[PDB]
Design a protein around this ligand. Structure first.
Ligand code: SF4
Length: 184
């Protein structure tokens, strides 16, 4: 828990390593104090994969869902705690919940209104992406190249370009591990 814990996953240092899909999910969670089912699975299994323990996950999710008075601790416990415990096997299930790879993510139903799951390289407008990429200090030529991949449907190539441009088998957890190792 020294490195990855319920508090450090909200740090700039740790979150700087998240790919765009995980950034989007974290932002939706931060703003709305909730995620719908598919996003609740994509993010929770990603965080399990980077080493967030069962206890730290329950802290993370309960604090995020109850933040800013969004719901009571009792409503979280009655309506969501089981679901997060289930993802960790804490009620004894033996289902093989592994983090979702990019192909799995892309194959989930496309996000509609109020959804944050999926792959932003596919799901965001080019204007939405460009603004997101300018905030990551990419220049126009860089953005044009990323968007060219997106228009071709090559979402994981777009994501790989973003990784290369922001640093000095496609899987969000690999992006994270690859990025985090470059901080060490
Ligand atoms: S290509 Fe994969 S890791 Fe990158 S944003 Fe899309 S789903 Fe996430």
């Amino acid at each position: 828990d020294d490195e990855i814990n319920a508090q450090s996953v909200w740090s700039e240092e740790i979150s700087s390593n998240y790919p765009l899909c995980i950034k989007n999910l974290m932002e939706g969670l931060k703003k709305n104090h909730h995620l719908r089912y598919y996003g609740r699975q994509q993010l929770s299994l990603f965080l399990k994969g980077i080493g967030l323990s069962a206890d730290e996950a329950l802290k993370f999710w309960s604090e995020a869902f109850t933040r800013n008075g969004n719901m009571t601790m009792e409503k979280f416990n009655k309506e969501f705690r089981y679901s997060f415990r289930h993802n960790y096997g804490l009620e004894g299930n033996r289902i093989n919940y592994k983090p979702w790879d990019c192909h799995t993510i892309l194959s989930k139903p496309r996000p509609g209104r109020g959804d944050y799951h999926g792959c932003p390289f596919r799901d965001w407008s080019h204007e939405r992406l460009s603004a997101e990429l300018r905030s990551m200090k990419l220049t126009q030529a860089q953005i044009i190249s990323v968007l060219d991949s997106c228009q071709k449907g090559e979402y994981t190539i777009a994501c790989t370009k973003v990784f290369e441009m922001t640093h000095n088998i496609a899987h969000p957890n690999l992006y994270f591990e690859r990025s985090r190792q470059l901080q060490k």
